[PDB]
Chain length 267, copies 6
């Protein structure tokens, strides 16, 4: 749509009540924002942080006013620097982002590293500041994510770069990540939220149903039968919104056997 | 209820212009494709395939047809294999697969070689008690490693799929039933009677549901090609919803719930 | 494992406080039982039933004294007759549960109900159990695990027949098509299920957890990979080379680079 | 060598009976299916699709045709998108076509018109070409090959960007993301496209169909395996 | 004809250098690898795997061999698995049976247990004797096979029975194995090689190229790109036996650039 | 890792004894190097070359002192120009299932069968003179195995079809841009930079690298991939106490007792 709308000021309302490690805000125009708020530790998550993010995300998913989720870190220095070095419920969170019917965007300034780097990849889109830094650390610190951290990363950057990223554990700047297709765009640090909000509003103008259907379709290319469950799940929901889909329910209400003879067969 | 399911069938001939097949439609919406070459045990040649592609294309587009029966003429053979391309039966195989209406193999006598892959491709197989199944390719050198191999495994399992292909034995109806190759076995005389019952049980059901499920069961096998079928049904469904039609007429989408 | 241990009496302890639609019980020896408790309506689930079952399975999961979960219906006439779409979440949750889940089925397992039992790792059926779908009969479908996974159990011909015709199948037909693991007399249903549960409790829970993730991994693509690899990660922490990283730069030279 | 690849093409018309498409053949083996509705920016309607299915079926069955070009009339559009969904049949057809199909794109390749170019084995883009999806903007989606297969071309991050926002992408953006195979100035679109077709025509047509089936088989599961073992069978008739 | 199939078998010893296995060849193309440690019920130690790998490799490359039998010494045990008194190189042996371009038949008498059960599963076919006993033990003894021992079992018996076999670690007799499709046939113990040899001979009647392509094709439903590799390998092989496949080599002989215009372009 | 350590000279020790077509060397710090040594025929392989690469790669796998294998061609003109004028499929699986990272070091030609080999390696380090391509369709052959499907998992399906259907040659820069190689370095520095990448991987956990290698194959190789990935899990399981309990039970005569282990969520 028009830039005037897209770059309009963002109003965030606080819904962080009871959260220790994260902030949770909503805009009136449909965006929910989850902020890892541990900037002293470069926004490393600990098990509490994960549990809170799971709650915030369950909430965003169930809130009809919300159509897009942003995941970010407080400050300019880190998105998320990984698991806290000082059990593995972050897997749950990965699943939860994967199966969330609304687009989830990673708004990344500075460090996205380790468990934190898998977090941004799990998100549908990544918006990077020009100061953003990406990479894995597992093999360097005796650990690994060989699940979506591995196979899904390949589906993003190809198998030669996935092997480089994991095996060597180097760091990559924003341009390097842009070039290998690891992030969707690179924007100046001062404009990060401006542009991220723009991208969200662009999606918000589009069909929520279409967006969830394509999301599941894109997962379905990776997640075998789990993907099929999402994709058919939307198909079922769509069916219930058609007349033939409503006959069974109308039949029961009217105390009669369903009659499918009165419906056209398509080719 | 038996009375309805076992009521007689009114077949109308639709075989106009076909040499190798007969093609019939019933008033209650059953289309039957019959290979009409029992002088060569119902083996197909390219023309036979080309005509089956036509019939099935007709059935697919006919609003009155819900279920297709594929069968052979007579009692001795369903299809004993191959003898307008050398291998167009592959095309016909796909078209059974992506056909949004259930296809049922009505098998009397022999279902061998290419003829055996054909009944397997059908969503269901009703077998007469005189039915015989098996592959032969390996004997003469030929073979089917596509759905002829992989998809057979998703029916009978990997041990028996290797057995059937590697030895190329013949199996009677009882053997086929116990390994899950056919859905049921009936006395030869009642073969059509039971097939029509199965067909009618399907006709009482939601055609849109049948078509989505069939696409879903295919999608466990056909990777991105199965996804195409399944998502295409979703797209189709979408256009019948209010939200889908709102985008067409334009687009204010905020008036539709962002469901969890 | 001798019969005397396996067929010992079972002590259930009620954990049902705050549950309106379900019962939730635990045994001394590590079995968590989730019982759908709406027999007036043949044990159909509404959204409340699903939310409670999710809660109870979440609890069973995080309880270290639980090794097996039994899912069942109250009474002798129905396991679950289907819906009265959050049941998708419950399905996902049964799938990724690191402990064996057992459907214990008496009478009707139908529709959404039938998909629940299939989702469970095993199914012990009473001789009075009935199975089948009803979607196409009532204008709906389950085309996720309800379809693909059914095929990985009974094969594609049977899967197509079950769905397309929506017939009903007795315990005998279900057993013969591989749909259930075993059929026992109605009176012995819990007795025999507890036995299967106890036999699993005698085995390595870490082994069961890996194998389950591994069996899922043959159906669930990268989602199965996430589970399996996640177990590998868990195992890795429990080793010295995995511990070395957390303990100055790390040094892995003191470790074999095996073949 | 450049002189051969760049020689003039001898087109022969085969557009008999077609309202919405042109269909031409060269002596050296190229078939060209042109969408001929430039007024509506080469959008397809059920007839167009029915006619493209016919032409593509012809090309597949002609021993003289080695390569097929799919394109739009004029310099402003390739195809700006759309029984109802017989374009799904045409997708399947492009997929299983045992010969390379090359999308020659000038101007817009949008919506269903975008999926069509993706479905082609190769895409040769003019410098004025524009790409994107529109479904979520216009209450539709292609979550079949339009989704998964897009991922296999551009990666999951770009595929989600393309579908979720439905922006437009210029030729350079398309090239850079692996979406098209090359970009040429508009005046050279067909000249360069024909060269690519002629480089494939110098190669083994059996080798090409086997490789296309193999690349498909990385996506289409048992349907990929069927294409693949179909070729092995056709190979095993060529032996003793 | 039953006269040919049940004719006497002439076995030729080729066990030179082996300590844990016998290795024989018949004059009509069957290779038989026999695990020979019956005092420990044919459990394999690392040396047993090394020798089974050599023997298998030899059978694969011997053009005179069309079919391979895997079996154990005596009537009481096929193979009861890893030796408790004791690298993980049975995975190599597993992979070798998988990619073996010839049919491999597990001839099972008595126990096929743990890793020994996994070996019989990997074999294309299994001929069991009425005394045969099957099952896993991993969870009973703190171990597991999660690769082919899990996933591929599922493709034999289905997900319900696979979960049963692995989770409970019971034993199953011959009738039970037959019923769940775990084995191809059950025969009397006295007749075990009589019958097994018959099956082998029914396979020798057919084309080795055809068998090879079908084995590859059926592996291809399970093994992703690895399967495709076997499948294409055969296709590349078939190709060379054609004119168009020979046209490249004849171009380089005649010192000319290849010409492919003279070949039809089938539909 | 510091630059001084990474760019330290490399001491290679010859291990090529009995090898005709290949050299095989090992450095003290854990790199093995298989060099195709037929520069006269642009380092193309004949059957014996493949037999020796199998042996040498088998050795590197079983040598516990080695953690990374480099694959390369002699001289600066070629890496491998492919088949000469099917056991190379065995060497392919062997690179695939090698629990240690395998790096292709490419100078000059990597072509045909020689091109599939570089793609098969986990990483590819390319010199600025490197040339990549297929030739099969031009000469009436094809690799429709990992040569096709896996190629697409590197460069995308549009480039995969372009590379196969046309059989052109691509310079280093083109190879780098479609993501076919990992980096392009000046020819003079080829081994300097290559050994650097190996050392960085050698500073990391060998157990981590093999799991992650299996996990990434497992996105391609179906149940075969699951066998690699589960095999590593089984292995790690033996290294835990719960896994040792089984065998400990047998050695102490008793029935195993798993009740004393935490049933985690
Ligand atoms: Cl030893």
């Amino acid at each position: 749509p028009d830039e005037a709308m897209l770059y309009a000021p963002v109003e965030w309302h606080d819904c962080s009540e009871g959260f220790e490690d994260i902030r949770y805000e909503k805009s009136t125009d449909g965006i929910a924002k989850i902020t890892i708020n541990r900037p002293q530790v470069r926004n490393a998550f600990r098990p509490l942080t994960v549990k809170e993010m799971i709650q915030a995300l369950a909430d965003a998913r169930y809130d009809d006013n919300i159509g897009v989720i942003i995941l970010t870190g407080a400050g300019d220095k880190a998105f998320c620097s990984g698991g806290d070095q000082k059990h593995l419920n972050v897997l749950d969170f990965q699943r939860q982002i994967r199966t969330c019917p609304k687009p989830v965007v990673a708004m990344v300034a500075g460090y996205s590293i380790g468990g934190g780097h898998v977090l941004h990849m799990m998100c549908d889109l990544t918006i990077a500041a020009d100061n953003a830094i990406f990479g894995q650390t597992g093999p360097k610190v005796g650990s690994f994510d060989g699940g979506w951290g591995a196979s899904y990363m390949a589906r993003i950057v190809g198998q030669k770069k996935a092997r480089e990223i994991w095996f060597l554990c180097r760091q990559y700047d924003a341009k390097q990540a842009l070039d290998m297709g690891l992030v969707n765009t690179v924007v100046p640090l001062a404009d990060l939220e401006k542009e991220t909000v723009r991208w969200c509003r662009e999606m918000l103008q589009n069909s929520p149903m279409a967006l969830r259907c394509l999301k599941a379709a894109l997962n379905a290319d990776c997640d075998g039968q789990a993907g099929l469950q999402e994709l058919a799940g939307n198909a079922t929901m769509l069916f219930y919104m058609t007349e033939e889909g409503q006959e069974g329910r109308n039949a029961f209400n009217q105390k009669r056997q369903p009659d499918f003879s009165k419906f056209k067969r398509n080719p």
